Design an enzyme around this catalytic site. Structure first.
Site, mmCIF file in Angstrom:
data_model
loop_
_atom_site.group_PDB
_atom_site.id
_atom_site.type_symbol
_atom_site.label_atom_id
_atom_site.label_comp_id
_atom_site.label_asym_id
_atom_site.label_seq_id
_atom_site.Cartn_x
_atom_site.Cartn_y
_atom_site.Cartn_z
ATOM 1 N N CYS A 247 -18.226 7.577 -11.723
ATOM 2 C CA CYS A 247 -17.047 8.443 -11.937
ATOM 3 C C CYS A 247 -17.066 9.236 -13.239
ATOM 4 O O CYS A 247 -16.256 10.161 -13.382
ATOM 5 C CB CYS A 247 -15.713 7.689 -11.898
ATOM 6 S SG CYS A 247 -15.070 7.175 -10.308
ATOM 7 N N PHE B 109 -8.875 7.689 -4.130
ATOM 8 C CA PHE B 109 -10.149 8.394 -4.036
ATOM 9 C C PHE B 109 -10.253 9.253 -2.776
ATOM 10 O O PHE B 109 -10.064 8.756 -1.665
ATOM 11 C CB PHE B 109 -11.298 7.381 -4.049
ATOM 12 C CG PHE B 109 -11.590 6.803 -5.403
ATOM 13 C CD1 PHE B 109 -10.940 5.660 -5.853
ATOM 14 C CD2 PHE B 109 -12.514 7.411 -6.236
ATOM 15 C CE1 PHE B 109 -11.222 5.135 -7.105
ATOM 16 C CE2 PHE B 109 -12.800 6.895 -7.480
ATOM 17 C CZ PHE B 109 -12.151 5.752 -7.918
ATOM 18 N N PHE C 274 0.820 -1.213 0.000
ATOM 19 C CA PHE C 274 0.000 0.000 0.000
ATOM 20 C C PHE C 274 0.854 1.262 0.000
ATOM 21 O O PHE C 274 0.522 2.236 -0.686
ATOM 22 C CB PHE C 274 -0.945 0.010 1.194
ATOM 23 C CG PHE C 274 -1.953 1.112 1.142
ATOM 24 C CD1 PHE C 274 -2.892 1.157 0.129
ATOM 25 C CD2 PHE C 274 -1.946 2.121 2.093
ATOM 26 C CE1 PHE C 274 -3.819 2.176 0.075
ATOM 27 C CE2 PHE C 274 -2.869 3.140 2.041
ATOM 28 C CZ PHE C 274 -3.808 3.164 1.032
ATOM 29 N N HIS D 197 -10.974 13.209 -16.854
ATOM 30 C CA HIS D 197 -11.164 12.741 -15.481
ATOM 31 C C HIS D 197 -9.966 11.890 -15.054
ATOM 32 O O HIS D 197 -9.719 10.834 -15.658
ATOM 33 C CB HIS D 197 -12.463 11.931 -15.372
ATOM 34 C CG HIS D 197 -12.601 11.202 -14.076
ATOM 35 N ND1 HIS D 197 -12.664 11.851 -12.861
ATOM 36 C CD2 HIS D 197 -12.674 9.880 -13.799
ATOM 37 C CE1 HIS D 197 -12.776 10.958 -11.894
ATOM 38 N NE2 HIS D 197 -12.790 9.757 -12.436
ATOM 39 N N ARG E 6 3.653 1.458 -1.547
ATOM 40 C CA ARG E 6 4.060 1.603 -2.949
ATOM 41 C C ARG E 6 2.965 2.218 -3.811
ATOM 42 O O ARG E 6 3.242 3.077 -4.667
ATOM 43 C CB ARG E 6 4.465 0.264 -3.539
ATOM 44 C CG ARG E 6 5.641 -0.347 -2.871
ATOM 45 C CD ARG E 6 6.683 0.673 -2.504
ATOM 46 N NE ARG E 6 7.898 0.012 -2.058
ATOM 47 C CZ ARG E 6 7.966 -0.787 -0.994
ATOM 48 N NH1 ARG E 6 6.891 -0.998 -0.243
ATOM 49 N NH2 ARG E 6 9.114 -1.371 -0.669
ATOM 50 N N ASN F 169 -8.715 11.708 -6.565
ATOM 51 C CA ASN F 169 -9.844 11.448 -7.446
ATOM 52 C C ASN F 169 -11.128 11.554 -6.620
ATOM 53 O O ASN F 169 -11.386 10.734 -5.723
ATOM 54 C CB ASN F 169 -9.654 10.082 -8.098
ATOM 55 C CG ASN F 169 -10.849 9.612 -8.924
ATOM 56 O OD1 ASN F 169 -11.932 10.174 -8.876
ATOM 57 N ND2 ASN F 169 -10.646 8.520 -9.663
#
Length: 374
Positions: A150, A201, A42, A289, A44, A322
């Site tokens: 999204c 996110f 995680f 996006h 990385r 995001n």
């Protein structure tokens, strides 16, 4: 008489998370500090993300109050809904207040409310709650768009255009508000898409005022919505997944999406810019996006985009993560502000025409042709 963006407001939750500290924090609050190899994986991802900061409604405090949300797949929907049916309308109200403030006209001139949210499925919906919170007219024509998600920043512009342009005098309040309360969950070896979810996110709300034929005395367009088109990529259902289940909203992104998007972008782009006679994708300004850094890199590579063309997009991803449907709208804001500050000829980095794109479940591509102003 093209529908135009007249004002833009954005907001985020109070709580900021530095990415460099997010691994340590995440694996603590999810009771997962023992899974050392997974916490290392995680790290990385986070440091490949190019996300420096995200804003989350969720705090350590809220997670002790709701331990189920901090696990991998314990029942947690009811808790997530209790959080979100209340918090989604409040952040929507903040972003919309800012837009109305910039716009400068009374709330009573607002005729339409298009409201996009993954979170807080409620009857009546977060749109009604937002009408009461923000003090909107009771006759406001509402379009409530739940869990799209999204690419829906392009969907709201697509609906806003027809609504603004078919109703003379209309003024449309568009609000995208995305909280990750419904998708947050602890780590698992077997669930790799979820590690991406957890590094990329963040939360955010964005709102715009759209109307056709502005009153040049009180209003000025920032961008004109020239055209808006949606499309399905063949044979890519299940390349982005999710369901609302008793464990909340699940999530899967396939490893094909960066390259798949980069392979379909030119048909969308040709369809969109042929009637304008544009073929040189470096001569328009860009608001794709940023689902992640690789979507951007693949778009750059496949079209031969110059290094600067996605500066605004990378700035939003960097500084906010995001934010699903809202992200492109933050990008709108970032570009116009930026162009004033550099004294560019137009709102869109000094060019005349630009594209806004959303990529989501479907796989869906939304393509919006934007016109700059000054």
């Amino acid at each position: 008489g093209l529908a135009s963006v007249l004002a833009i407001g954005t907001a985020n939750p109070e709580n900021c998370f530095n990415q460099d500290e997010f691994p340590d924090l995440c694996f603590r609050v999810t009771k997962s500090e023992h899974l050392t190899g997974l916490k290392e994986k995680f790290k990385r991802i986070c440091e490949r993300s190019t996300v420096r900061k995200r804003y989350l409604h969720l705090t350590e405090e809220i997670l002790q109050e709701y331990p189920s949300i901090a696990t991998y797949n314990a029942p947690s929907l009811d808790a997530r809904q209790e959080i979100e049916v209340a918090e989604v309308p409040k952040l929507a109200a903040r972003a919309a207040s800012k837009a109305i403030e910039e716009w400068g006209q009374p709330k009573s001139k607002i005729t339409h409310l298009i409201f996009c949210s993954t979170s807080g499925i409620d009857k009546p919906g977060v749109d009604c709650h937002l009408v009461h919170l923000l003090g909107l007219p009771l006759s406001v024509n509402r379009v409530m768009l739940y869990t799209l998600g999204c690419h829906a920043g392009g969907t709201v512009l697509r609906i806003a255009k027809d609504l603004a342009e078919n109703n003379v005098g209309s003024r449309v309040l568009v609000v995208c508000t995305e909280l990750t309360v419904m998708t947050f969950r602890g780590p698992s070896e077997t669930d790799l898409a979820n590690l991406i979810r957890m590094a990329i996110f963040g939360d955010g709300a964005a709102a715009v005022i759209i109307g056709a034929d502005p009153d040049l005395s009180i209003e000025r367009p920032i961008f004109e919505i020239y055209s808006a088109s949606q499309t399905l990529v063949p044979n890519t259902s299940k390349a982005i997944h999710g369901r609302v289940l008793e464990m909340g909203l699940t999530f899967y992104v396939d490893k094909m999406v960066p390259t798949l998007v980069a392979s379909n972008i030119e048909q969308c782009l040709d369809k969109a810019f042929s009637p304008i006679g544009i073929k040189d994708w470096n001569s328009i300004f860009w608001m794709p996006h940023p689902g992640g850094p690789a979507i951007l890199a693949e778009i750059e590579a496949k079209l031969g985009l110059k290094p600067e063309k996605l500066r605004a997009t990378k700035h939003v991803l960097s500084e906010y993560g995001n934010m699903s449907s809202a992200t492109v709208l933050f990008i709108l804001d970032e570009m116009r502000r930026r162009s004033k500050k550099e004294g560019k000829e137009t709102t869109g980095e000094g060019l005349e025409w630009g594209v806004l794109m959303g990529f989501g479940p479907g796989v869906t591509v939304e393509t919006v042709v934007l016109r700059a102003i000054s």
